[PDB]
Every structure is written in C-alpha cells, then in structure tokens.
C-alpha cells in the first residue's frame, strides 16, 4: 500500500542521452540507432533568439560544425536535416544501447516521465502531465533543452516530448519527436502565453479510486449523479467535461473497488461544492489530477517493465 | 524554474536488480560484483512468518535451493551467508553492470530514491525521506521486498535502504545493506508500531528557500527570531529542533537568496501560528519536509551524474 508520484525507470533513456554543441550553445540530444535528435535552436546565438530564421541559420552550417559527445566519446556527424522544430544529425555510429522505441504524440491529460539532463548527463527523473493547455509543469534550467519525456510499455520506450522552452508562469513547452510543438507555441524569444488551464477530471477520479484502494475512504458519500448533472458542476470549478470514453477508461478501477463511476462523481461533486474542511486524501490537501487511470492501476498492481 | 519531487536516474541500479526464489517465495535481490544481497525472509513460508527462526531455516538450505535469475539467465549460487537481516548469495558470475558503489547508513531527515521492483524487474522510481521515526512513506506491494533505496554522487551509487515490510499505518520499514533495520523493527509478522513522527524542520526551511528561488515569496515577513525562540514554537507544532548544524547546512541557500536562516525561521514561525489562509507555496497547500538543502541546491543548480 502507499501511493507516490512514481516515474518510469529511466535506464533505457539514459543510454540514449548525448550532448550537442554548435558554436557556443550546448544542449542535449537523443541518440537512437545512427540518428541524434535535438532542438533546432542549438544553432542559435543570443542575438538570433528574438526572431531566428532557422532554415537560414542551418544553410550556413555543415556536418563538422556539430560537436556530438556520448560520454567522453565524440560521435562524427555525417548528415543533418531539420524536421519542424528538431534537428536530425546522422552519425557514423549506431547507438548500441538503443531500446525498442516509438515516437508518439500524446493527448492532453496523459502523463509521462521526464529525464532532466544537462550537457548530455541525467540529473533526475520526475512524472508530468500534458496539461489541457498543452504545457507541462516541469523543472528545467538553462541547458535542459533536448531532455525528453517518455512512457514505457514492457520493453518499448514511447518518446512523446522533447523540451524547448519556459513560459512566463514557470511552465514548460516542447515538441513531439517529429518537432511539432504541443500547443500554439513557437521556438523564439518573444512574449507567449499559455491558454487558461483546466483540471483533468478523469484523473482526479482515478486518484480518488487510488485513495479508496489505500483505505482513505472518508469522502465517499451515499449519493449518485447523472453524467450531465456532474458536468454542470465540473464546469463551474474549471474541470474538463467527463465523457463516456472517460467513464469506460475508469472501468477497471470501478470494477475493482465496486464503486460505480457516477457514484464516485457524486462524491467528487461534494468535494468541489464543500471543500475538504482541512482534511487530506492520500496525504494531499488539494485534489490531484496528474495520475491517469492507467498510472493508478500500474502502481497499485505492480506492473513492471 | 519549476520545482518537482525529483528522483535520481535509476539506470545504474536497474542493471543490478535480480529475482531470488527459494521454494515458493520470490523477492528481489541486488547483484554487485559476484554477490546477491536480498532480504532473509525469502527463505520463509507463510507458516514461518509469525515468528521465524532464520538461522534454523538457513541451516536447512543449500546453495542450489536458491534460484537467482538476472533477466532470462539463471545465476549459479556457490555460497550463502546471513548478515543481520540480509542474505548474501555468492554467485559464479560477477555483474558486468556493477557501478562504483558504497553501502551507507543514512540519518533521519535524509532523502533517497527508491527503485520499486517485482520479480527482479523495475516498476518505478520515486523519492522518499527517512522519517524521524525510522519509517519511509513509500509505495510497495507484495513481492517488492529487496527493492533498494539509493543516492548518487557523480558516478557512485550509495545504497542506503533495502525494503522489508509494511507497518499498520501504510508506512514502510527496512534495513541498510548490512541488514540492520532502521528503527526498532523486526522482520516478523507481529504487531509493530512506529513511534510518533515529527516534521523535518531543516527540510521545510530548505523548501521555503526553493520557493523564494522560484519567485513564490508571499510568506516572507519583515521579522527575525532567535534560534531558541523559534525552537519553542517548532516544539508545539511537532517540528524537530533546529540545530546550529542545520543552520550551517542551510548556508548555501541563505547566501544565494540573501535571506538569513533566522529570518526564514521567523517567516516559518508565522506560517505555523497563522496557517496559509488557503494559499499555496510551490503549488502545495501543506508545508513540505521531504527535500533536503542538498536536494534543493541540486535541483535548482542542475547537478548531473
Ligand atoms: C533550453 N535549453 C532552454 C530551457 C529554458 C531555459 C530556462 N528554463 C527553460 O525551460 N530553452 C530556452 O532558453 C528557450 C530558447 C528559445 C529559442 C525557445 N527560450 C525560453 O524558454 C525563453 N522563454 S520564451 C520562449 O521567451 O517565453 C526564456 C529564456 C525567456 C525562458
Ligand atoms: C516484501 N515483499 C513484503 C513487502 C510488504 C507486502 C505489502 N506491502 C509491503 O511493503 N514484506 C512482507 O510481507 C513482510 C514479511 C515479514 C517476514 C517482515 N511482512 C509485512 O510487511 C507485514 N507487516 S508486519 C511486519 O506484520 O507489521 C504485512 C504482510 C502484514 C504487511
């Protein structure tokens, strides 16, 4: 028993991290087979960052201008190309530590692990959610770009995020591994704002089921609700609408605990209208929305990779 | 910017995890050089667990009774011995993935990462604190014993915890890698209770400095306090006494922000006496005590391994 914010084991991704330096700027890259993926702004100087023309800057760079290091070993670059906001550097050596992998584009509300890196070396791993406004609440400093986010399924690493930038509220934005940004953001130093965020309702419900599984049951009430009436309340508290797809995805936790989803909705409705009155759920004084139904099942059932 | 509960990268420890089975019970083991370390209760059956005589049970076991698997590969056991509450199984093959390592016994208030494993395979990584009552708030299921806790310093893994058991409140207890329990616990299925816990004051202060570094400064007041007067307040709210050693350890964060430790103590005293009035600090509605000063510096300065 117990419930923690748990990240995926990071070893498979650690063996793919490299350092990419072009001129004076060094960021991280992801080395898979004979290709290194990194943010395109590695080719910018400080003056270039207000409004860079990346295609122009890349035209003036040749393979040898890219210094790629894997540990203390230089990897020789033999080709380069730009795909959306990422550079693909072909190297003359395939990474022998390349895991089975896929590039996926995750949906808002889904979670992943981030392996935060500097100079191609890992500093830590934490779990994040793709927010409804297409930002993540991460922890990233200068030099962290090219750090990646990922899920693991058995032996397969699904890379879903590459880190590019920080937005005024202390929140983070990036691309999938094809270089397309999540959200309406661009890779330039100009004023950009995230849309208003919203609470991921299906995830709060998943975490309430995690609490029941752990014996923290005080908030269960005796009522039920309709899906339509729940959503009228959710709306006022800035919660996403709950869909029938979300109800189905909560099926395994509902079946395990014997609490119908609409009954858990009635209990959540009460928490939203009345507060927690100084109580905690799973140790938290606020309702938590960064665990998916799958995360709850995986942690409470001991799924391994 | 941003502040997350961040675990160490787990790859170095992942390459050491193995499965140990004796009879019907399977737990995890730690394979370093030619030795596998695991909890001694792998040799118990269900009937044995109320009050096992481990020395007696081990006398009746020979090397071949221990089935050790590293992935799909059986490792042949060639010797066995018991050290306190851990078994040491000598195997005929040294682990080629053994990192530089040390066995350390950590002090209450210190943090570590746990790599939770089942059947020798990792399921997730999370950060934990050794509580003042010598328990940890983890997330562990049947089969998780032998999962380890660790810190990393550059290239060196300091193993400090091996998981053995769960106590009535949903909290966890274990040993160092020499098999000595943290706390007054024994490895048997009998009623055991943890002492009353207390809040790790130096860590709350460290996290308040993390908040200042991130721009969350609303709680800073205009006052100072003496160390003695702060401790009189801390006492009433079940906080550990702050010592001059703790004040010195907070020196780097104090110097970085220009806030004297005793001035931050005055601000904490106000939070304890008055509450947060529905506000949050770094997103949390409760004061957080599972970040050490070192964790704050490492995360806010981008320390890598
Ligand atoms: C990548 N190494 C770095 C990560 C930032 C640095 C501080 N915290 C982070 O997450 N990315 C940047 O510095 C990017 C670079 C451009 C070309 C996208 N710039 C920013 O993130 C910028 N924010 S913005 C796009 O102007 O609103 C900063 C530097 C003002 C944070
Ligand atoms: C190790 N695999 C297992 C980990 C437990 C299982 C549930 N959550 C955990 O953390 N450890 C045990 O089952 C130990 C075994 C003995 C010999 C120490 N037993 C317990 O943890 C026991 N608690 S106790 C010592 O009786 O208070 C349980 C099974 C009642 C939780």
From Swiss-Prot, chains A, B:
Localization (cell): Host cytoplasm; Host Golgi apparatus; Host nucleus
Domain Peptidase C30: 1-305
Organism the protein comes from: Severe acute respiratory syndrome coronavirus 2
Signal peptide: none
Function: Cleaves the C-terminus of replicase polyprotein at 11 sites. Recognizes substrates containing the core sequence [ILMVF]-Q-|-[SGACN]. Cleaves and inactivates human TRMT1, preventing tRNA guanine(26)-dimethylation of tRNAs. May cleave human NLRP1 in lung epithelial cells, thereby activating the NLRP1 inflammasome pathway. May cleave human GSDMD, triggering alternative GSDME-mediated epithelial cell death upon activation of the NLRP1 inflammasome, which may enhance the release interleukins 1B, 6, 16 and 18. Also able to bind an ADP-ribose-1''-phosphate (ADRP).
Catalytic residue list: 41, 145
Outcome after substituting residue 132 to H: In strain: Omicron/BA.1, Omicron/BA.2, Omicron/BA.2.12.1, Omicron/BA.2.75, Omicron/BA.4, Omicron/BA.5, Omicron/BQ.1.1, Omicron/XBB.1.5, Omicron/EG.5.1
Cytoplasmic compartment segments: 1-305
Record's subunit section: 3CL-PRO exists as monomer and homodimer. Only the homodimer shows catalytic activity. Interacts with host FBXO22; this interaction promotes the proteasomal degradation of nsp5.
Reactions mediated catalytically: TSAVLQ-|-SGFRK-NH2 and SGVTFQ-|-GKFKK the two peptides corresponding to the two self-cleavage sites of the SARS 3C-like proteinase are the two most reactive peptide substrates. The enzyme exhibits a strong preference for substrates containing Gln at P1 position and Leu at P2 position
Effect ascribed to mutating residue 142 to A: Does not affect ability to cleave and inactivate human TRMT1
Description of how activity is regulated: Inhibited by pyridone-containing alpha-ketoamides compounds 13a and 13b. In turn, alpha-ketoamide 13b (tert-butyl (1-((S)-1-(((S)-4-(benzylamino)-3,4-dioxo-1-((S)-2-oxopyrrolidin-3-yl)butan-2-yl)amino)-3-cyclopropyl-1-oxopropan-2-yl)-2-oxo-1,2-dihydropyridin-3-yl)carbamate) inhibits SARS-CoV-2 replication in human lung cells. Inhibited ex vivo by michael acceptor inhibitor N3. Inhibited ex vivo by compound 11a and 11b.
Outcome recorded upon mutating residue 205 to V: In strain: Zeta/P.2
Protein name: 3C-like proteinase nsp5
Sequence position, cross-link Glycyl lysine isopeptide (Lys-Gly) (interchain with G-Cter in ubiquitin): 5, 90
